[PDB]
Amino acid sequence: NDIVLHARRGTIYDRNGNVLAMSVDCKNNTKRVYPYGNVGVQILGFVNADNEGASGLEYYYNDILAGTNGHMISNITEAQNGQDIVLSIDIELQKKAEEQLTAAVKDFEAKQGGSIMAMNPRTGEIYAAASYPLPDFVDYESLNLKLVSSIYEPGSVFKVITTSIGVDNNLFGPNSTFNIPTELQVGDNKVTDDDWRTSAMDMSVREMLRRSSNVGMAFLETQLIGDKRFAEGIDKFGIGHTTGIDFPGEATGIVRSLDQYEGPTGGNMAFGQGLAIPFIQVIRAYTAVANKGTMVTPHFMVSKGGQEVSWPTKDVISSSTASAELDMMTTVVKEGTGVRAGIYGYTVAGKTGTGQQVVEETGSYGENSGFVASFCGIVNPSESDLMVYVGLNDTHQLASQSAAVVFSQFAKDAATRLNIQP
Ligand SMILES: [Ca+2]
């Protein structure tokens, strides 16, 4: 004769206080109700029939969201309901992120979907985030956030890390100019740029970034940085380390340590080849450039039990280096491959990338690996309020015509929705 008094799980609020998930006895059982339907459910996760969090934040914070049931046996013990959680997510921005990512995947023929995220580079709070395919009502693979749990060869979006390391080590600056050949031998393979020249070009570090020269990056790493300082910087930037994001399934990635480097490793990694990491690591690294040199922890939960949590930060580069990098990322958007990411009335510092799909458990790939088109940008970098990432997986269209285009529209909407006026 032991009756269960079912506790209710804690409520999940978005940043404006909208209820995203709440438990109800209309189930005797309890069930979650998601008022905005499928919007943000990928982040929220689902709760199964045993009322256990099964994916997303429901799972990640299940021990605090789940209460403790009561029991009626002449003896009664109280149900303790779970603790409420407030997230950084702006539900209306989440809806746009989802619809824009879905439309982009369709328009640019991204055969393996993509991801999108808007975050505050100073506090680390995530305003919106999504991966395609998205779930509804259910395919278990759509419950992951690809940004966190899938790994890719990052490609050219990584060049901001390589230049930051050099600059922060005082080995060159934006205007430093070098005679860059058409190709360079790295290990036993040649590095080349897809371009017009048939001769070496004198290019400043700023220019190598503007045009995204792989050859220039490999030159910088091999002739100026050196593998040791390179590998130390990668490590300081958190590359190959989990970011600490509060979401399940975070991949650490596959990144060679210095003692495992071989002939071509450093040169290739300089332009984002020879490692495979989740894009959340790239995003996290960019926060250092956007936040005066301090890298933050991307995250969803702002408060639990009315207790605001402190999230770890790390000083990676100086503010001067961060400023020189932002200056160059601004050239990318004003004068280079990122020009379609520009947004009328705002300053956008960013970088395009062409990355690759990889064998998930090894980080390598063959001839038919699909390309990943990415764009990562910071809006009004002096305000420290917004950075957005857009990635399209297995598309044939260049990041300059695809991911950068999606960013201009979504980052604009993120900026209107938030404080950001210009
Ligand atoms: Ca590029």
Residues, CB-to-ion distance under 5 Å, ligand 1: 156, 212, 352, 354
Q: How far is the CA of 209 from the centre of ligand 1 (A)?
A: 9
Pick the CATH number of 145-334 from 3.40.190.10, 2.40.50.140, 3.40.710.10, 3.40.50.12280: 3.40.710.10
Q: How far is the CA of 54 from the centre of ligand 1 (A)?
A: 38
CB 399 within 8 A of CB 114: no
Distance CA(235)–CA(368), nearest Å, equals 30
Q: How far is the CA of 30 from the centre of ligand 1 (A)?
A: 50
Structural method: X-ray
Q: Which residue has the tokens 């789940």?
A: 66
Q: How far is the CA of 94 from the centre of ligand 1 (A)?
A: 27
CB 371 within 8 A of CB 355: yes
Q: How far is the CA of 46 from the centre of ligand 1 (A)?
A: 37
DSSP tag of 28: -
Helices 279-290 and 319-335 sit at what angle, rounded to 10 degrees?
Answer: 110
DSSP 41-79: HHHH--B-TTS-B-SHHHHHTHHHHS-B-EEE---EE--
Q: How far is the CA of 23 from the centre of ligand 1 (A)?
A: 46
Q: How many Cβ atoms are within 10 Å of 37's Cβ, its own excluded?
A: 10
Q: How far is the CA of 403 from the centre of ligand 1 (A)?
A: 10
Q: How many Cβ atoms are within 10 Å of 33's Cβ, its own excluded?
A: 11
Question: Which value, to the nearest 10 degrees, does the dihedral of the CA atoms of residues 83, 84, 88, 93 take?
Answer: 140
> Could you give the C-alpha distances from 386 to 47, 189, 281, 292, 391, in angstroms and in order?
31, 39, 17, 14, 17
Give residue 402's identity as a one-letter amino acid code. Answer: S
Q: How far is the CA of 288 from the centre of ligand 1 (A)?
A: 21
Q: Which residues of 229-266 are buried (b: 16+ CB within 10 A; e: fewer)?
A: bbbebbebbbbbbbbbbbbbbbbebbbbeeeebeebbb
> Could you give the C-alpha distances from 186 to 217, 264, 265, 275, 335, in angstroms and in order?
11, 5, 8, 16, 29
Q: How far is the CA of 2 from the centre of ligand 1 (A)?
A: 65
Q: Before 133, cis peptide (omega within 30)?
A: yes
Instruction: Return the biggest CA–CA distance within the chain.
Output: 91
> Could you give the C-alpha distances from 343 to 51, 283, 327, 407, in angstroms and in order?
45, 20, 17, 9
User: Which residues fall within 8 angstroms of residue 237, CB to CB, at 6 or more apart?
Assistant: 161, 164, 165, 285, 288, 295, 316
| Closest by Cα among 400, 405, 376 to 281 | 376
For this experimental structure, what is the resolution in angstroms?
A: 2.0
Number of residues that make up the chain: 422
Q: How far is the CA of 86 from the centre of ligand 1 (A)?
A: 37
Q: Which residues of 193-224 are buried (b: 16+ CB within 10 A; e: fewer)?
A: beeeeeeebebbbbbbbbbbbbbbbbbbbbeb
Checking the chain for breaks where C and the next N are over 2.5 Å apart, the residues before them are 27, 73, 137
SS3 call for 26: coil
Q: How far is the CA of 125 from the centre of ligand 1 (A)?
A: 27
| Closest by Cα among 161, 81, 93 to 322 | 161
Q: Please return the burial class of 228, using the count of CB atoms within 10 Å of its CB with bins 0-12, 13-18 and 19+.
A: exposed
3-state SS track over 150-189? CCEECHHHHHHHHHHHHHHCCCCCCCCEEEECCEEEECCE
Strand partners, 254: 276
Tokens describing residue 323: 């400023």
| Closest by Cα among 409, 317, 392, 312 to 356 | 392
User: What is the distance, to the nearest Å, from the Cα of residue 305 to the centroid of all Cα atoms in its chain?
Assistant: 27
Sign of CA dihedral 51, 52, 58, 61: positive
Ranges assigned E (strand) in 330-385: 348-356, 371-379
Phi-psi region of 50 (alpha: psi -120 to 50; beta: other; left: phi over 0): alpha
Q: How far is the CA of 191 from the centre of ligand 1 (A)?
A: 15
Distance CA(262)–CA(248), nearest Å, equals 33
